[PDB]
Amino acid sequence: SVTVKRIIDNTVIVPKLPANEDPVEYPADYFRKSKEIPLYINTTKSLSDLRGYVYQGLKSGNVSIIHVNSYLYGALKDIRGKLDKDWSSFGINIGKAGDTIGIFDLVSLKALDGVLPDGVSDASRTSADDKWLPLYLLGLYRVGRTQMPEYRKKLMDGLTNQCKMINEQFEPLVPEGRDIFDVWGNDSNYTKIVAAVDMFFHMFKKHECASFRYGTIVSRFKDCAALATFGHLCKITGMSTEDVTTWILNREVADEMVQMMLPGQEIDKADSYMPYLIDFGLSSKSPYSSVKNPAFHFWGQLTALLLRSTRARNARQPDDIEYTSLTTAGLLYAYAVGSSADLAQQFCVGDNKYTPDTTNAPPQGRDVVEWLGWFEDQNRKPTPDMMQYAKRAVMSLQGLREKTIGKYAKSEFDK
Amino acid sequence: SVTVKRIIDNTVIVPKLPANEDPVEYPADYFRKSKEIPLYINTTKSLSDLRGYVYQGLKSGNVSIIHVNSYLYGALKDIRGKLDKDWSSFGINIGKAGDTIGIFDLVSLKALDGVLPDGVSDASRTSADDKWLPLYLLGLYRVGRTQMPEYRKKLMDGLTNQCKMINEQFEPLVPEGRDIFDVWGNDSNYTKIVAAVDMFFHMFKKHECASFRYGTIVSRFKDCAALATFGHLCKITGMSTEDVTTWILNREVADEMVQMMLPGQEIDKADSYMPYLIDFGLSSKSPYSSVKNPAFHFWGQLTALLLRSTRARNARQPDDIEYTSLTTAGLLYAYAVGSSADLAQQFCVGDNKYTPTNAPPQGRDVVEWLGWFEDQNRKPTPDMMQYAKRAVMSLQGLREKTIGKYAKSEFDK
Amino acid sequence: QPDDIEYTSLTTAGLLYAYAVGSSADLAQQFCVGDNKYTPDLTTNAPP
């Protein structure tokens, strides 16, 4: 099939179609360029000052990102945090035995010239400062990324978090529109700050100010949905990462799995940079994204859904994937895991179930090959019970959002 | 059948019918005339100025396209963009070898005499300039092309994009009517500008100002729907471009596929001119259009739809095509791909699945299926028509005259 | 629906033509790779 030809007149034709570039970009394969995550923050000038440029700047539609940036640098040099262990990543040392370090031993710079208010926007603001203001500011990263009454859900609670040994009201005017400060997202250095705040308090989980991760948290594995629906599939099938992996039954799902699992990227690593590849700008097209792993994302979720997952219910149904092979392979894996439970006596009193005491009855366990065999044995077309299993998984599901694998499954199966 | 005759009186008759010209026009087979994409931009006069002629010109029903044109030229000489690689197309060099180039190394001219306001519309407008105003302007290409509450959807978001790192309110008065600035579309040089802005930022995807593609994007493969529903069919059947191609089962669908796949047109090319054949005026009747590929468009979507496609649901049902052979051939392909999935162990641990009347064929070979179909008295089977009815029942909110609404009516009952 | 025409022979002849064209579609392999459906591999009253 490298070479197609029309039959009646017997002329060639080259079916070609619009290319589709943007390769992925891995964390590691970027520290092969630079060894530092440059955080340009400019006005290393007064903090007492900057604290004001932002309190006032926020109670109105205009506060410069460049200012909030610099404000955060100011509030966040709680050089607190004693590395009880070591800490490196991708070559980058960060601190060895017990070394005392702060949120920014992740390589600071300083940039350009333009900055708004003069000397003092107002003397009002005391150091009811770090206490919350940064929290609140970082928390707007989280709010900015969203779109439905979750925005007001997210703000309204990402605003009872500054009522924590503070007390207060709530600032800035317009609800949302992904517009009011949803631009901070677009700011290379802002993202770098939240990414650092999280990566830091992620490490020093017990810190007093660790409460700050409230908004800074949606940064960890930002754009790594498929990576995370992998881990969820595993957890929801109770199966091991490797055994789940064998259950991948489509070239372009395995292609993506291969792309995700690429080594020396610190995926699995305790406290690595990788989770923040996107916000630290180590990558501008993450290889763990739903969108670069559409087939994997669909399958893994559809499967988990069938296996009673609450999450998957609402996972988006990626477009331009082969739906009618991904679902089949999902159904099967779901069926396998589903029908044939994992029951096994765990405790006893000298007495336990030594277990080694029909035609076409589904396979004993969860071996891919046992099941593939069984399926081929099924003329390669999903069986009545399994399709019933599927219809039992999805009927009774209500409140399904359009274009989710949830709504997909229910339509594919309940009728 | 070249020669028909009536029987009783046995006289001839020549069934003839109204001809139907407008041939297609390919990109390539146009650089066999010219080697330059002439962008007539006139008033190479002040920009600070032009920035005003448009800010004020837009806050009111009258701003000359000729002005916005020239304004864009002014704002868009971010001569930024270092060709990390090479860059040619159709013979046209654009830059080698680290060559540093800007949005207009796509051949500028300059035209006529008439221009509206005098010296200064109003000194008001600072260089809160390129920052957005061009974006906004270009974004109105996108808005102009449309027709339903998508217009207000499209503007209302193609207006929170100038609230970016830039953040400033919305502008002209009347909602739409494909009339207020939906005429910029008709402007040979405007289109050429957006076409260039896209083709450029399409190349320099990471550029700071690449945010501009927001409206400039519906220019890429403008009028190449069939070309793109080809790629979608492929993607949706997981099949290869060539294997999908063999599955074409109608003269006039293959005729169109042949017309589309015509070589030396840079379809498949990385960053080519071809996607903009229409807007660069390299063509005035694109061979990739739904309308010149009606049969192909229908089939490919109907099929995709059957194969669960979300897109196809809403593809228009082209007229004056043979619906009842296109559907049959679509159903079949859909059935093939559908029923017989693509399963195959991908990973393992030394242990893998060595896999070796009238039941449908094992895989997705056209001939295996054609045979099977002929074996079926050439009339789609109960399960396959059930497969179709399962594909389309449960589909709701179908718009009239879409292949969606068609399928559901053809199949759910 | 034009008036003063024979409706019940025009419809019959229409139905038939419709049926012909309809039922028996137009399928035929158009492209390939050296392998195509050579088609010349029913008795009673099955349509033409």
PDB file of C-alpha atoms in Angstrom, chain C:
ATOM      1  CA  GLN C   1     -47.248  18.407  -8.025  1.00  0.00           C
ATOM      2  CA  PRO C   2     -48.308  19.404 -11.569  1.00  0.00           C
ATOM      3  CA  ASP C   3     -52.002  18.945 -12.319  1.00  0.00           C
ATOM      4  CA  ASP C   4     -53.792  17.065 -15.100  1.00  0.00           C
ATOM      5  CA  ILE C   5     -51.103  14.422 -15.475  1.00  0.00           C
ATOM      6  CA  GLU C   6     -51.435  10.690 -15.047  1.00  0.00           C
ATOM      7  CA  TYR C   7     -50.355  10.434 -11.439  1.00  0.00           C
ATOM      8  CA  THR C   8     -50.707   6.697 -11.042  1.00  0.00           C
ATOM      9  CA  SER C   9     -48.336   5.665 -13.818  1.00  0.00           C
ATOM     10  CA  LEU C  10     -45.924   8.460 -13.337  1.00  0.00           C
ATOM     11  CA  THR C  11     -45.524   7.443  -9.696  1.00  0.00           C
ATOM     12  CA  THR C  12     -45.277   3.783 -10.585  1.00  0.00           C
ATOM     13  CA  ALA C  13     -42.572   4.551 -13.198  1.00  0.00           C
ATOM     14  CA  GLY C  14     -40.921   6.822 -10.655  1.00  0.00           C
ATOM     15  CA  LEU C  15     -40.970   4.324  -7.809  1.00  0.00           C
ATOM     16  CA  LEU C  16     -39.493   1.783 -10.151  1.00  0.00           C
ATOM     17  CA  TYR C  17     -36.658   3.948 -11.366  1.00  0.00           C
ATOM     18  CA  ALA C  18     -36.143   5.103  -7.790  1.00  0.00           C
ATOM     19  CA  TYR C  19     -36.126   1.517  -6.606  1.00  0.00           C
ATOM     20  CA  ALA C  20     -33.732   0.376  -9.358  1.00  0.00           C
ATOM     21  CA  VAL C  21     -31.228   3.131  -8.669  1.00  0.00           C
ATOM     22  CA  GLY C  22     -31.888   2.937  -4.975  1.00  0.00           C
ATOM     23  CA  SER C  23     -31.706  -0.666  -3.947  1.00  0.00           C
ATOM     24  CA  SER C  24     -28.935  -1.649  -6.354  1.00  0.00           C
ATOM     25  CA  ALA C  25     -26.257   0.929  -5.530  1.00  0.00           C
ATOM     26  CA  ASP C  26     -23.191   1.805  -7.563  1.00  0.00           C
ATOM     27  CA  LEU C  27     -20.300   0.225  -5.688  1.00  0.00           C
ATOM     28  CA  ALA C  28     -17.037  -0.581  -7.424  1.00  0.00           C
ATOM     29  CA  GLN C  29     -13.457  -0.542  -6.189  1.00  0.00           C
ATOM     30  CA  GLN C  30     -11.792   2.588  -7.523  1.00  0.00           C
ATOM     31  CA  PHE C  31      -8.240   2.384  -6.181  1.00  0.00           C
ATOM     32  CA  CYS C  32      -5.858  -0.390  -5.111  1.00  0.00           C
ATOM     33  CA  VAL C  33      -2.348  -1.837  -4.865  1.00  0.00           C
ATOM     34  CA  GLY C  34      -2.275  -4.590  -7.508  1.00  0.00           C
ATOM     35  CA  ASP C  35      -5.282  -6.208  -5.782  1.00  0.00           C
ATOM     36  CA  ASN C  36      -8.870  -5.384  -6.830  1.00  0.00           C
ATOM     37  CA  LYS C  37     -12.351  -6.966  -6.927  1.00  0.00           C
ATOM     38  CA  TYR C  38     -12.599  -9.050 -10.056  1.00  0.00           C
ATOM     39  CA  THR C  39     -16.344  -9.399  -9.661  1.00  0.00           C
ATOM     40  CA  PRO C  40     -17.419 -12.251 -12.060  1.00  0.00           C
ATOM     41  CA  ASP C  41     -16.956 -14.934  -9.364  1.00  0.00           C
ATOM     42  CA  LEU C  42     -29.466 -15.803  -7.757  1.00  0.00           C
ATOM     43  CA  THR C  43     -32.316 -17.794  -9.279  1.00  0.00           C
ATOM     44  CA  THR C  44     -35.774 -16.474  -8.534  1.00  0.00           C
ATOM     45  CA  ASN C  45     -37.488 -13.071  -8.679  1.00  0.00           C
ATOM     46  CA  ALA C  46     -34.737 -11.207  -6.818  1.00  0.00           C
ATOM     47  CA  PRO C  47     -34.594  -7.671  -8.313  1.00  0.00           C
ATOM     48  CA  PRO C  48     -32.186  -7.037 -11.247  1.00  0.00           C
TER      49      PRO C  48
END
